[PDB]
Design a protein around this ligand. Structure first.
Ligand SMILES: Nc1ncnc2c1ncn2[C@@H]1O[C@H](COP(=O)(O)OP(=O)(O)OP(O)(O)=S)[C@@H](O)[C@H]1O
Ligand SMILES: Nc1ncnc2c1ncn2[C@@H]1O[C@H](COP(=O)(O)OP(=O)(O)OP(O)(O)=S)[C@@H](O)[C@H]1O
Lengths: 219, 218, 219, 218
């Protein structure tokens, strides 16, 4: 089959159960982490930080070194299967901070040559995670701090391009809502098929499931 | 056909290679290789030291059978290999790197009897599938196309003792694995992994191919 | 166990008895130290100051030099064991002033290179204290002076990110109340699980226990 | 087997090491090393000065026994070590830095009798657990797998005098600790502490491993 010999594949079947990636930049003290772990079915790879206190339930692993980070990503297939074995439910793998990934990769490589290598490390990680993402049915989510998400463009470009849904989480008693509605002031994008229509792009008390259901089924 | 019987003798007595080597003053690596039938030559000194140490006559050390087999592989095989792409670089699964559409060739075997008379049998072997022995390793499986015409070859093979038969099967497989692996490595270019490093060619050479056929049952 | 090989651990069990860190920034004479030591079960590592008079009971250790500071932190495990052996109850370790930590670390290192090293010292301290924090079941609390808490962002960023609860204490007869309700004018954040709801984010006559109970059990 | 008896003789007479060194004009460090059986060579001058000083014949200074033991460790051991991470850098607890999944190997012992005849015993030793002797220090514990086949070795060991037996046990342990420590240091990379500095490799070398088995009871 010349079709099979090349990578050509049908879209209707590919978009049916696809696991979307989610990037959430919620500034400070808003609930973007709560959002990621609200489902209580999450594995949090936090970096030099411990924000697991907010999560109701799930799995978690402190990352203290770039070497430690490389090991967990390489053995991630083996790890996820056993949590499912122990009976723990993992549907999403979360990296707590993109800025810390910049800091750790920089230490490993320690100029624009250095910055380009740092970008190369970041792009390589996403490609590796994605091939496993299709294999193990795990949603990926990365979170960062407002300062658009704060970082150097080469990274921002790569993150925004690859990310399916990019959202900004803000608090408006007080109501906490995730607003992905288009806007010049802040940049957001949700990907849905032509037939699917999002009547409301702001979600109050949001969870990864609710977003998934909105992007697969009618809002 | 001839093989050393050191591995069996030591097992019945229960002496380990590590100790025997210390006493007979023969380096462990050489004694281990000679324990297997891998070595091609044996030094007269080794035959006497061991024979005096285990109170075994030279007769016991060697097993002999007048039969003798020869295998020749076609210089020109028919092979078609299609690159699969699919980002093999991330996960080291050979299947992603390349796929064999069809690889078929002939192996000529001459079973020389104890008498001068010899019999000629011609085997045609083709690719069937690539089995996954373990998650990280695979074994290409090749099946003989014509077996009914070469049923007589089987009668000569099973006549050998079990130890000789296991040796012969290792020899036919080692050659096959070298033949197929060498052909593939040339047609497909190497791919180095992003994250020590295992290039595609190294993985292909490591891969082993074992013939699956009625004639050979072990 | 591939799960155990890596640091991956369950969350429901991790958030059950977690000892939260508390950062309380206040203006002058707002009784911020009273709150931290009201429980009368506290060890105060005051820096070049003596505010133990407001406290009724507990153990206080004056810190006069960066070298003295390093020693107490390194031997802190051994110390906690002895005060508990004497029967003194220590549940919280308090550093009186973050600005003094900036001043002392600066003397030890005496440019942006100097500032980055000062940030490196501050981040390292928290990581060290945290691993002991899980081991010895001690709540950590740091306090500073309003001028948001006054400091250089690199420090502020690290403190706010790591701190579980950040609160501002103000006096409003006059009443002393800690307000962590969200607000553009002042920044506050309390971390609680989705099921837990804080009906009232302002606490009058507050103590560390009351906050702990509010963040574990229903307000 | 042979050891100096200086430590016992001085204790009975009650003389301190410092006074003896000042009188016999031998440097304290050398006399202390020789008090232990650590030194390999002894100068004839030392044997006479001490023997004249303590009115002891040369016979008394040395204890001898015709028995002689030899120990050989496998060149190729089977070892699996898994990095544990968990921020060892903060608290110096080796367990956090690395964990041994399984380390097993063989030690070959030859008990040569007074007569030319020698007996060969083969010991297989495996990892069991890492005991914590003190909060800052640990001792890897290894247990002999097969002891029933090598019961006879024990009969030869306890036949020695207590002083010789304590010496032999030190020799078997010192070698084991060097062997296991050297293997681990290569597989695991060093980690330097944040807060003089104690790198992981230095801690691993300091760590000592003591064999726990019925054969050796002291
Ligand atoms: N959907 C929500 N409804 C009401 N309050 C919420 C909601 N999400 C978050 N909060 C509040 O915010 C707290 C959690 O904030 P976090 O999730 O830690 O904020 P974040 O922005 O993800 O993280 P940092 O560390 O503050 S940048 C909760 O305990 C609530 O006080
Ligand atoms: N014709 C349209 N009407 C309404 N919304 C639309 C329309 N086209 C796109 N959108 C919105 O934009 C989403 C798709 O954006 P994309 O097609 O991915 O944008 P793009 O600019 O082509 O690609 P990048 O990756 O963002 S540069 C949809 O899910 C809608 O939210």
């Amino acid at each position: 089959d010349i079709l099979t010999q090349l990578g050509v594949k049908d879209i209707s079947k590919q978009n049916a159960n696809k696991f979307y990636k989610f990037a959430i930049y919620g500034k400070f003290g808003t609930g973007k982490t709560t959002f990621l772990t609200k489902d209580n079915n999450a594995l949090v790879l936090d970096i030099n930080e411990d924000g697991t206190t907010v999560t109701e339930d799930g799995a978690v692993v402190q990352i203290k070194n770039y070497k430690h980070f490389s090991a967990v990503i390489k053995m991630l297939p083996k790890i996820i299967e056993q949590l499912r074995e122990n009976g723990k439910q993992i549907d999403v793998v979360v990296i707590e901070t993109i800025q810390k990934l910049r800091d750790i990769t920089m230490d490993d490589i320690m100029t624009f040559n250095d910055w380009g290598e740092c970008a190369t490390r970041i792009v390589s990680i996403y490609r590796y995670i994605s091939k496993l993402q299709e294999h193990y049915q795990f949603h990926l989510a990365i979170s960062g701090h407002e300062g658009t998400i704060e970082a150097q463009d080469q990274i921002k470009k790569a993150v925004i391009s690859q990310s399916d849904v990019l959202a900004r989480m803000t608090i408006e008693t007080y109501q906490y809502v995730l607003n992905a509605e288009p806007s010049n002031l802040f940049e957001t994008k949700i990907r849905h098929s032509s037939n699917i229509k999002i009547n409301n792009k702001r979600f109050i008390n949001p969870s990864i499931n609710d977003v998934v259901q909105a992007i697969r089924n009618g809002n | 056909m001839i093989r050393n019987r050191l591995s069996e003798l030591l097992s019945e007595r229960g002496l380990k290679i590590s100790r025997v080597a210390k006493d007979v003053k023969i380096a462990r690596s050489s004694l281990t290789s000679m324990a297997q039938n891998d070595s091609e030559m044996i030094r007269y000194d080794a035959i006497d030291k061991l024979c005096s140490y285990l109170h075994i006559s030279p007769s016991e050390f060697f097993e002999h059978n007048p039969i003798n087999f020869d295998f020749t592989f076609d210089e020109e095989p028919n092979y078609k290999i299609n690159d699969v792409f699919e980002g093999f670089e991330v996960t080291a699964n050979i299947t992603h790197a390349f796929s064999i559409e069809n690889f078929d060739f002939e192996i000529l075997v001459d079973v020389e009897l104890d008498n001068r008379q010899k019999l000629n049998f011609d085997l045609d072997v083709s690719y069937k599938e690539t089995e996954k022995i373990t998650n990280s390793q695979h074994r290409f499986i090749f099946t003989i196309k014509n077996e009914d015409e070469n049923i007589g070859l089987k009668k000569y093979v099973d006549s050998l003792s079990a130890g000789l038969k296991n040796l012969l099967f290792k020899k036919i497989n080692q050659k096959l694995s070298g033949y197929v692996s060498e052909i593939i490595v040339k047609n497909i270019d190497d791919i180095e992994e992003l994250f020590k490093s295992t290039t595609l060619h190294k993985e292909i050479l490591q891969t082993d191919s074992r013939l699956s056929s009625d004639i050979f049952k072990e």
